[PDB]
Amino acid sequence: GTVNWSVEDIVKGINSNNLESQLQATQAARKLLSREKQPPIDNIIRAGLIPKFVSFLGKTDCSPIQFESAWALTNIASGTSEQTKAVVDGGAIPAFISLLASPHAHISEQAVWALGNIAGDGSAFRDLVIKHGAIDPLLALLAVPDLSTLACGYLRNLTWTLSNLCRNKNPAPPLDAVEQILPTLVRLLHHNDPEVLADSCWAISYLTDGPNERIEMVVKKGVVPQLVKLLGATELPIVTPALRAIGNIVTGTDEQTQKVIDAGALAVFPSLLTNPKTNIQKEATWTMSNITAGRQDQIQQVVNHGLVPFLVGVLSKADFKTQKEAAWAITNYTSGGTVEQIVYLVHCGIIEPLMNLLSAKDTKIIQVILDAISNIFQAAEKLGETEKLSIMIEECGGLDKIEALQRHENESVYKASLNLIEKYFS
């Protein structure tokens, strides 16, 4: 009936002054735009169909044509930026915001989905969706005593759309918009559905990706213990955004970092630093580097949780990107740590895996490792154990590597290696 119609046929039907012919032609468009292989999105746009579909959204008396035009437009809006712009230029945003008030849950859900694709395009369309007043009718759809009474697919679409209103930077979402959405986000962060939890975490990860003022807004809502609980989930789609949110928070103040430690995040790190997914190990090691960039009492919490042997582990064997993040964790620790904490680090066997990485063809990691060697030597000066450390570096072939680095292309590497050889190996 409405399967495999040409764009020409769809235009003929939509241009008839017959509501039923228009409904059949809109369903035919929807079925075309729903096909897996190459939907003719640009052909539908060039035929001037978008304003016609947008005007069908207003046909309150024909709920089927509202659903069909809403689905058709959602599939166009899910395309490239140009294809999303075409939907916005067709006047779809206020028309989709009105549809959130529809008594039909399947039409209302379609409007949610469409707005999520529009807001997801970038900052400008996100902020345009907010200026047309989408947040209040969206949040009113979740104004229920228990989220479990809502349809699973419906709740997942709403959470996803709200996460897209939290997404993108330059600029970040309006503060006022973030303050309005956050109490609903916190509630979704406690829902039992894994997809709702994954998208709620992603929303939190976006809001924590900014200045300390933005991290504060989130931390003050008391979500860090719930993020730490989600950090221990079995589902990788929940752990990934949970770890990103936690990692972002610790880029903030020492006080914000402390909320993460107080919530018990460090107890999850033995499994995160040995996780079979390399992006988890990498981001967990990145999170560690920002905690070792903190206070001496925070470095002490890292020590007390038995995480130093785990940092020795990731430095010894991991994918290069994780090893680079481990080198940063070691330099940060040796920069802010006490003599006792640096002594402990060397005792745990950091020297051999640290010297082995001086063979990597990456100038940033060499600089980071050279800064770490320098800091460790500064602690050995305070103990008069410089000779003992010099022997350890010689014994695992580190001296031969630092000597070679004197004839390096990079100025900073050449100068740092030259200093260590002249100060402790001459």
Binding site: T74, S78, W160
Partner: peptide
């Protein structure tokens, strides 16, 4: 992100 309905 953007998502199509199939």
């Amino acid at each position: 992100r953007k998502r199509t309905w199939r």
